[PDB]
């Protein structure tokens, strides 16, 4: 009987296919989980980078201000020195 034999073949193929499709979707789902974790990891890294880079920007900004004030003080002090030397 070709109908019974064909049905046997089709049932075996369907079950093998579904077993492998289940396994393949399970592997894909593991990949999606790994990707989700990786994206959280990248977000955390970006937050750390933003933090430290802007702290260093702040530090440069403040150092430039301190330096401008220190050099202005030096200029005034040396000006007074040269004025007194000119009086002497």
């Amino acid at each position: 009987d070709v109908l019974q034999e064909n049905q046997k073949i089709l049932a075996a193929s369907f079950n093998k296919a579904m077993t492998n499709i289940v396994d393949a979707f399970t592997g894909v789902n593991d990949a999606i989980t790994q990707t989700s974790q990786a994206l959280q990891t990248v977000a955390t890294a970006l937050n750390k980078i933003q933090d430290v880079v802007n702290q260093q920007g702040n530090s440069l900004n403040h150092l430039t201000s301190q330096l401008r004030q220190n050099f202005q003080a030096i200029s005034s002090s040396i000006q007074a020195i040269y004025d007194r030397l000119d009086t002497i």
Binding site: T26, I32, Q50, N58
Partner: protein, 55 residues
């Protein structure tokens, strides 16, 4: 001699702004995690379709 010419130029700070990118990545991570949960149920559904036929 004379008073030295001392110049320190004005510093113009560019801010690194990653807030939108950080939020976007957090949202994408959450979307993928939800999808994982939905896919587990779909996988179970497919697994339930295996046939146990007799002849």
């Amino acid at each position: 001699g004379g008073v030295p010419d001392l110049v320190v130029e004005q510093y113009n700070q560019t801010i690194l702004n990653l807030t939108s990118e950080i939020s976007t990545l957090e949202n994408k991570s959450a979307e993928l995690n939800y999808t994982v949960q939905k896919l587990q149920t779909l996988i179970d559904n497919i697994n339930s379709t295996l046939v146990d036929l007799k002849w």
